């Protein structure tokens, strides 16, 4: 993976140059937004369970999916579903706090579309669940940090779709 800092050292390194004023402006940008990211990751760390509960309650419950015939009908599949949501929340927090979505490229979105199209997981409903996590999470962390979290949830949704 890489954060914003590593990305700056990648560009400056791969040019062979040292750190010029542009790269220092990018690191100043990240170091200004750092505290906000920290407290956002603190809040999400606090209320993960309630994010997944409220987002499943908004997006998936009392529908064809949890009715019989639906993908989430058995208790095994319900638990696997909310497990999957937890991964999306956790790695979206890592992606927020790194400031670079390369983590989502390496450890989440790789082979996931082939996996869900293998098993039979509906992609539509997954995306709507992730967007429900985006609205609930933005409600917890506020406007600015909700924009940051939203970008990474939208990154995963753009990955599966």
């Amino acid at each position: 993976m890489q954060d914003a800092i590593t990305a700056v050292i990648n560009t400056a390194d791969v040019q062979g140059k040292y750190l010029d004023d542009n790269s220092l402006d990018k690191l100043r940008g990240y170091f200004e937004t750092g505290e906000l990211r920290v407290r956002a990751a603190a809040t999400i760390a606090a209320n993960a369970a309630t994010i997944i509960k409220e987002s499943v309650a908004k997006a998936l419950l009392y529908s064809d999916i949890t009715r019989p015939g639906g993908n989430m009908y058995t208790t095994r599949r319900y638990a696997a579903c909310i497990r999957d949501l937890d991964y999306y929340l956790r790695y979206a927090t890592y992606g927020m706090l790194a400031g670079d979505p390369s983590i989502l490229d390496e450890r989440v979105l790789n082979g996931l579309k082939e996996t869900y199209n293998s098993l039979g997981v509906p992609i539509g409903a997954t995306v709507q669940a992730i967007q429900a996590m985006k609205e609930v999470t933005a409600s917890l962390v506020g406007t600015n940090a909700g924009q940051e979290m939203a970008v990474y949830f939208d990154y995963i949704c753009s990955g599966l779709s």
Binding site: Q2, T6, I9, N10, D13, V14, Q15
Partner: peptide, 9 residues
């Protein structure tokens, strides 16, 4: 990694 080999660069 911090040093990565892109064909672009």
């Amino acid at each position: 990694g911090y040093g990565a080999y892109s064909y672009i660069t």
